[PDB]
């Protein structure tokens, strides 16, 4: 199709001169578009050159990049009856890539990395002074498992049942294959990890082509990778691991004091390079980013053992337990912090390679590690990591005391998103940023700043096809007011509002998928509604995603709205944009042919973290009281309107309330502005204009 | 030859106010004008109607060619109010009972008038329309205003996977020319099978009253029809004789047949100042100019159509006539 061709002309031009670009695709019909140019512009140069860095924001887009990568396979197989050099490497989840926690554990929880270092402990045991080695061990790294991936694509799924057969564990052969440069479909919570980030950088080496799939949310995954909670809880869990810290102790200070000793003498002469390159598969601790922080040379505690460091270590979070139980209203800065700390106690700014280097020589010292005592050394490890180094924008900042007893909390505000993104700018170039959910494109250019090309979406036709009407007047326009504010007001306007989306759900019985700035509205409208005359009628069952998400009630609610689309039912979708699973899977009747909004996305206020952030990016780049209720919000709704746009070949009609879309952009600006009971007469046309434009347009 | 299951949607979605006065009469008057013109260009055909009332499916008349048994019930349906909800699995597996017993040199089709936008069926419809699919039954949904997926797999599945019978009516005059396109057959592509029936009477006329008889119903008539076999004086239909099983047709099956064969040549059309021969119609006489918005540069060139069997003149009222009855052409008897 011409309009994705100029797409690739786009991707070409971009692959072969910039070394970044902005690239607006329209939503639906853009994701096929890059796998194939990347693999062409790949195989123009020469095969092996550079390879594909997919990076989306959650696994189910992991999985159509990795079927449809299966498609380039058979395409490229299909039509020239030639084989090359398979590529595609599934890089998934750790619980869901493995095969032994389904058998013994049945568990699907975060500790399966845990049992997996327990279980390679028991072969490097097994293979040094002496549990089992595992289910299959020691064949994962030879050349004939190097070579399953590159005659015959085992991703993921396939990847599983194939080491269900031949009796392996994907876990080492991933790993073992992010050095043979696939093609790795991977998840942004991993390209900035401060854990994941460090091995994966220096596994694939570098030099390859980056593609920011959906990359609207960045700043998000760069302000989630700090923010730690400390919630009174850690305290003594941090007390306990004191506790359990002196008893180790005690027990190495007992009888076997002579591998501390030597350990201590590799530290003392080889610090921790010497014992980060002496250790191999051994389980690694948390850290702010090695590349990114920069530091070497890490002394052991001033040259001393782990009695001092447990010592400065009880003395380090009793002194956090000082600074978290005070009145209520209090900010940090984190130079003003650490100057407090050393005026309670001299420990200068080196705690961090005091806690790099001390969690490492512990590990060396443990054979029978406890889980909680161990992960809330980590955390502290963190704190301390992060108050003696990044400053620059980061902001410690203390809970108010609210009623007072749920209270001392402390957390770490992070510092500017651009720092964090920085290393790929040095480590790459001509990387790929495609995102359908992102108008207008300027502030990608103003907030982070690189320099970039900008490629907005030239595809615009059959605007038949595409009904794009927004609702203005409610019948008294007294609905869209009063939905407007973060705690609802005269809880009897919100009845009437229900009453009309029970009007509008009885008008258009043909699946809808309804969404709410927040769960306060869901919330006080299923309590007492005064009707459900939809749900005896027209939709049978309604389908309402918890304020607390679940995996297993949201995978039964998909695949009973699926099973009731496809026996001719229908339920209506009562989801928050703010809420988990953006969604993204339709081409499809089964999905909401109708979707309705409820007023424009609204982000809490009257937080701290927003002050925060306000006043930062306040000093950044001057877009105070402007960008936070309209970028954010209008970045929410385009996640709603991705949802409707699913191909030319198939229609939907997204209803917007309030007038204050007006003042935002919206993909595709072709919008008309009436009234909802207009509105109602006008899909009902709409449904069979729809019906009746196919077959005269084909 | 046919077999068309009607079923109506007779459900409380019908008592809203779309047709005038509303769905339910409209589409019981368009079924009974349907059951005429259908018997009229399909004698020795089969029709069975069933309602999908009160979440069930009621079979009111049977399968049969007698017309009057059809528009009496249709006409017991408009005195009763369409309540309850459509169900098109038990309106699909009453067709299979009825389409079953059709022998299978026989159409099998069911024609159903969908008014909801949901229905209401106890088991899974999939399984329903595999059965379908395996003992081969065309099914046709005329619905009403917007799809429903499930009619697109239904119209789909039911047609050799191909999409195109699945029609949205939007006013009275889309569902009457839906009702008209039921009227005529689908010649499709089929799947290559075998084909005949044998054993087709031809009655003799019995014009005697003065004592009467029925072997049939036992009752008096004014004259009957006489199986060529069982030799019964019966009521006469073209149909099928209850004696002894066999035809009674005459110059209904060559009707329907001649019908079914009609090539329907459309006409060229080619101007005056083209075809250079005085305006003329063979059918009647046309001195009329066809063509004659602008001055002289419309009305000096008119419209001439063309029979190229026979390359003579007609004009377009008679085209249309001879499209709707008659055969083909005067000119082509004439060589
Ligand atoms: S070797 Fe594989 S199956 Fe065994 S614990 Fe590790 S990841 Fe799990
Ligand atoms: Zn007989
Ligand atoms: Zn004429
Ligand atoms: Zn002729």
Same mark, same amino acid.
């Given at each position: 199709?011409?309009?994705?061709?100029?797409?690739?002309?786009d991707?070409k031009?971009?692959?072969?001169?910039?070394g970044?670009?902005?690239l607006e695709?329209?939503?639906?019909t853009g994701?096929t578009?890059?796998?194939?140019?990347?693999?062409i512009?790949?195989?123009?140069?020469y095969?092996?050159?550079?390879?594909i860095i997919?990076c989306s924001?959650?696994?189910?887009? +992991?999985?159509?990049?990795?079927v449809?990568?299966e498609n380039?396979?058979?395409?490229?197989?299909?039509?020239?009856?030639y084989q090359?050099?398979?590529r595609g490497?599934?890089?998934?989840?750790?619980?869901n890539?493995?095969?032994h926690?389904?058998?013994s554990?049945?568990?699907?929880?975060?500790?399966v990395?845990?049992?997996?270092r327990?279980?390679?402990?028991?072969?490097?045991?097994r293979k040094?002074?002496e549990? /089992?080695?595992?289910?299959?061990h020691?064949?994962?790294?030879?050349? %004939?498992?190097?070579?399953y991936? $590159?005659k015959?694509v085992?991703?993921?799924?396939?990847?599983?049942?194939?080491?269900?057969e031949?009796?392996?564990?994907p876990?080492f052969?991933?790993?073992?294959? +992010?050095?043979?440069?696939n093609?790795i479909?991977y998840?942004?919570?991993y390209?900035?990890?401060?854990?994941?980030?460090?091995?994966?950088?220096?596994?694939?080496s570098?030099?390859?082509?980056v593609?920011?799939?959906?990359?609207?949310?960045?700043?998000n995954?760069?302000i989630?990778?700090?923010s730690?909670?400390?919630?009174?809880?850690?305290?003594?869990?941090?007390?306990?691991?004191?506790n359990?810290?002196?008893?180790?102790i005690s027990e190495?200070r007992?009888?076997?004091?002579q591998?501390l000793?030597?350990?201590?003498?590799?530290?003392?002469?080889?610090?921790?390079?010497?014992?980060?390159?002496?250790?191999?598969?051994?389980?690694?601790?948390?850290?702010?980013?090695?590349?990114?922080?920069?530091?070497?040379?890490?002394?052991?505690?001033?040259?001393?053992r782990?009695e001092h460091?447990?010592?400065?270590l009880?003395r380090?979070?009793?002194?956090?337990?000082?600074?978290?139980?005070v009145?209520?209203?209090?900010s940090?800065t984190?130079?003003?912090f650490?100057?407090h700390?050393?005026?309670?106690t001299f420990?200068?700014?080196?705690?961090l #390679?005091?806690?790099?280097?001390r969690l490492s020589?512990?590990?060396?010292?443990?054979?029978?590690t406890e889980?909680?005592?161990?992960?809330?050394?980590?955390?502290?490890?963190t704190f301390?990591?992060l108050?003696?180094?990044?400053?620059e924008?980061?902001?410690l900042?203390?809970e108010p005391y609210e009623?007072?007893?749920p209270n $001392?909390?402390?957390?770490?505000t992070?510092?500017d998103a651009? &720092?964090a993104?920085?290393?790929?700018f040095?480590?790459?170039?001509?990387?790929?940023?495609?995102?359908?959910?992102?108008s207008p494109?300027?502030?990608?250019?103003?907030?982070?700043?690189?320099?970039?090309?900008?490629?907005?979406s030239?595809?615009?036709?059959?605007?038949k096809?595409?009904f794009?009407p927004?609702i203005?007047?409610?019948?008294?326009?007294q609905?869209?007011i009063?939905?407007?504010?973060?705690? #609802?007001?005269?809880?009897?306007?919100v009845?009437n509002?229900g009453?009309?989306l029970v009007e509008?759900?009885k008008?258009?019985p043909d699946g809808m998928?309804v969404?709410?700035?927040?769960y306060l509205?869901?919330?006080?409208?299923?309590?007492?509604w005064?009707?459900?005359?939809?749900?005896?009628?027209?939709?049978?069952?309604?389908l309402?995603?918890?304020?607390?998400?679940?995996?297993?009630?949201?995978?039964?609610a998909?695949?009973?709205?699926?099973?009731?689309?496809?026996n001719?039912?229908g339920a209506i979708?009562?989801?928050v944009?703010?809420?988990?699973?953006?969604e993204? &899977?339709?081409?499809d009747?089964?999905?909401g042919?109708?979707v309705?909004?409820?007023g424009?996305?609204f982000?809490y206020t009257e937080? #701290?973290?927003?002050?925060?952030?306000?006043?930062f990016? #306040?000093?950044?780049?001057?877009?105070?009281e402007?960008?936070?209720?309209?970028?954010?919000?209008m970045r929410?709704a385009?996640?709603?309107?991705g949802?409707?746009?699913?191909?030319?070949?198939?229609?939907?009609?997204?209803?917007?309330?309030?007038?204050?879309?007006?003042?935002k952009?919206?993909?595709?600006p072709?919008?008309?502005?009436?009234?909802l009971?207009?509105?109602d007469?006008?899909?009902?046309?709409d449904?069979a +204009?729809?019906?009746?434009?196919?077959f005269?347009?084909? | 030859?046919?077999?068309?299951?009607?079923?109506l949607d007779?459900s409380?979605?019908?008592l809203?106010?779309?047709?005038r006065?509303?769905?339910?009469?409209?589409?019981?008057?368009?079924?009974?004008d349907?059951v005429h %013109?259908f018997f009229?260009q399909?004698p020795?055909?089969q029709?069975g109607? +069933?309602?999908?009332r009160?979440?069930?499916?009621?079979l009111?008349?049977?399968?049969?060619?007698?017309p009057?048994?059809h528009?009496?019930?249709?006409?017991?349906?408009?005195?009763? %109010?369409?309540?309850?909800?459509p169900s098109?699995?038990?309106?699909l597996?009453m067709?299979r009972?009825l389409?079953?017993?059709?022998?299978?040199h026989?159409?099998?089709?069911?024609?159903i008038?969908?008014?909801?936008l949901?229905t209401?069926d106890?088991?899974?419809?999939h399984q329903?329309?595999?059965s379908?699919?395996?003992?081969?039954?065309?099914?046709?949904?005329?619905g009403?205003s917007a799809?429903?997926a499930i009619?697109?797999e239904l119209?789909?599945?039911?047609?050799?996977?191909?999409?195109?019978?699945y029609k949205?009516?939007?006013?009275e005059?889309?569902l009457? %020319?839906?009702?008209?396109?039921?009227?005529?057959?689908?010649?499709?592509?089929?799947?290559?099978?075998?084909?005949?029936?044998?054993?087709?009477?031809?009655?003799?006329?019995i014009?005697?009253?003065?004592?009467?008889?029925?072997?049939?119903?036992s009752?008096?008539?004014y004259?009957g029809?006489?199986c060529?076999?069982c030799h019964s004086?019966?009521?006469?239909?073209?149909?099928?004789?209850?004696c002894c099983d066999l035809?009674?047709?005459?110059?209904?099956?060559?009707?329907?047949?001649?019908?079914?064969?009609?090539?329907?040549?459309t006409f060229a059309?080619?101007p005056?100042?083209?075809?250079?021969?005085?305006?003329d119609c063979?059918?009647?006489?046309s001195?009329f100019?066809?063509?004659?918005?602008?001055?002289?540069?419309?009305?000096?060139?008119?419209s001439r159509?063309?029979?190229?069997?026979?390359?003579?003149?007609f004009?377009?009222?008679?085209?249309?006539?001879?499209?709707?009855?008659?055969?083909?052409?005067p000119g082509? /008897?004439?060589k």
């Open positions: 199709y011409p309009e994705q061709y100029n797409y690739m002309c991707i031009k971009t692959l072969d001169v910039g970044n670009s902005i695709m329209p939503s639906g994701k578009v890059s796998l194939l140019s990347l693999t512009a790949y195989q123009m140069h095969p092996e050159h550079r390879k997919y924001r959650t696994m189910s887009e +992991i999985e159509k990049a990795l449809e990568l380039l396979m058979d395409y490229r197989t299909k039509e020239l009856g090359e050099d398979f490497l599934g890089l998934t989840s750790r619980k890539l493995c095969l926690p389904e058998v554990k049945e568990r699907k929880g975060t500790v990395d845990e049992k997996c327990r279980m390679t402990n028991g072969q490097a045991k040094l002074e549990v /089992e080695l595992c289910e299959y020691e064949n994962l790294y030879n050349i %004939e498992v190097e070579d991936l $590159p015959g085992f991703s993921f799924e396939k990847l599983l049942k194939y080491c269900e031949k009796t392996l564990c876990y052969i991933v790993r073992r294959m +992010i050095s043979l440069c093609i479909i998840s942004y919570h390209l900035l990890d401060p854990k994941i980030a460090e091995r994966v950088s220096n596994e694939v570098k030099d390859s082509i593609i920011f799939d959906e990359a609207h949310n960045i700043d995954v760069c989630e990778s700090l730690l909670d400390l919630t009174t809880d850690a305290l003594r869990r941090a007390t306990r691991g004191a359990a810290l002196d008893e180790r190495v007992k009888v076997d004091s591998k000793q030597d350990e201590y003498e590799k530290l003392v002469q080889g610090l921790x390079x010497x014992x980060x390159x002496x250790x191999x598969x051994x389980x690694x601790x948390x850290x702010x980013x090695x590349x990114x922080x920069x530091x070497x040379x890490x002394x052991x505690x001033x040259x001393x782990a460091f447990v010592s400065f009880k380090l979070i009793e002194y956090l337990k000082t600074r978290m139980k009145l209520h209203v209090i940090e984190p130079k003003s650490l100057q700390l050393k005026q309670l420990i200068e700014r080196k705690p #390679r005091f806690c790099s280097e020589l512990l590990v060396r010292t443990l054979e029978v889980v909680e005592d161990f992960t809330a050394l980590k955390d502290i490890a301390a990591t108050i003696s180094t990044y400053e924008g980061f902001l900042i203390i009623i007072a007893v $001392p909390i402390m957390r770490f992070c510092l651009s &720092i993104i920085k290393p790929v040095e480590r790459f170039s001509s990387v790929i940023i495609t995102s359908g959910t992102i494109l300027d502030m990608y250019p103003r907030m982070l700043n690189f320099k970039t090309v900008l490629q907005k030239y595809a615009m036709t059959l605007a096809k595409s794009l927004m203005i007047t409610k019948g008294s326009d609905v869209a009063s939905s407007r504010f973060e705690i #609802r007001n005269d809880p009897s306007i009845r509002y009453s009309m509008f759900a008008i258009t998928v969404f709410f700035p927040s509205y869901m919330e006080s409208i299923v309590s007492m005064q009707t459900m005359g939809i749900l005896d009628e027209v939709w049978k069952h309604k309402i995603l918890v304020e607390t998400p679940d995996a297993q009630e949201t995978s039964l998909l695949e009973t709205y699926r099973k009731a689309c496809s001719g039912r979708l009562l989801s944009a703010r809420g988990k699973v953006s993204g &899977i339709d081409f009747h089964q999905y042919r109708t309705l909004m409820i424009i996305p982000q937080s #701290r973290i927003l002050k925060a952030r306000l006043e990016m #306040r000093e950044n780049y001057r877009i105070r402007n960008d936070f209720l309209s970028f954010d919000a929410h385009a996640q709603c309107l949802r409707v746009l699913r191909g030319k070949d198939d229609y939907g009609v997204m209803v917007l309330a309030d007038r204050r879309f007006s003042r952009r919206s993909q595709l072709k919008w008309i502005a009436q009234g009971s207009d509105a007469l006008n899909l009902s046309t449904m +204009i729809s019906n009746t434009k196919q005269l347009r084909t | 030859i046919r077999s068309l299951i009607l079923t007779c409380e979605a019908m809203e106010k779309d047709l006065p509303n769905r339910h009469a409209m589409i019981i008057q368009y079924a009974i349907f %013109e009229d399909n020795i055909s029709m109607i +069933i309602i999908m009160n979440g069930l499916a009621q009111v008349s049977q399968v049969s060619g007698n009057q048994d528009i009496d019930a249709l006409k017991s349906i408009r005195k009763q %109010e369409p309540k309850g909800n098109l699995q038990n309106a597996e067709a009972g389409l079953l017993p059709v022998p299978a026989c159409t099998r089709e069911v024609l008038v969908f008014g909801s949901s209401t106890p088991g899974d419809i329903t329309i595999d379908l699919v395996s003992e081969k039954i065309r099914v046709k949904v005329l009403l799809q429903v009619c697109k119209c789909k599945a039911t047609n050799y996977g191909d999409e195109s019978f949205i009516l939007l006013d005059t889309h009457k %020319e839906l009702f008209n396109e039921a009227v005529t057959p689908x010649x499709x592509x089929x799947x290559x099978x075998x084909x005949x029936x044998x054993x087709x009477x031809x009655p003799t006329r014009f005697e009253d003065t004592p009467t008889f029925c072997s049939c119903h009752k008096l008539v004259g029809y006489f060529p076999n004086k019966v009521c006469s239909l073209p149909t099928v004789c209850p035809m009674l047709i005459l110059x209904x099956x060559x009707x329907x047949x001649x019908x079914x064969x009609x090539x329907x040549k059309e080619v005056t100042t083209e075809k250079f021969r005085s305006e063979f059918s009647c006489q001195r100019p066809x063509x004659x918005x602008x001055x002289x540069x419309x009305x000096x060139x008119x159509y063309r029979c190229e069997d026979c390359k003579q003149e004009c377009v009222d008679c085209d249309v006539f001879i499209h709707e009855i008659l055969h083909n052409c082509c /008897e004439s």
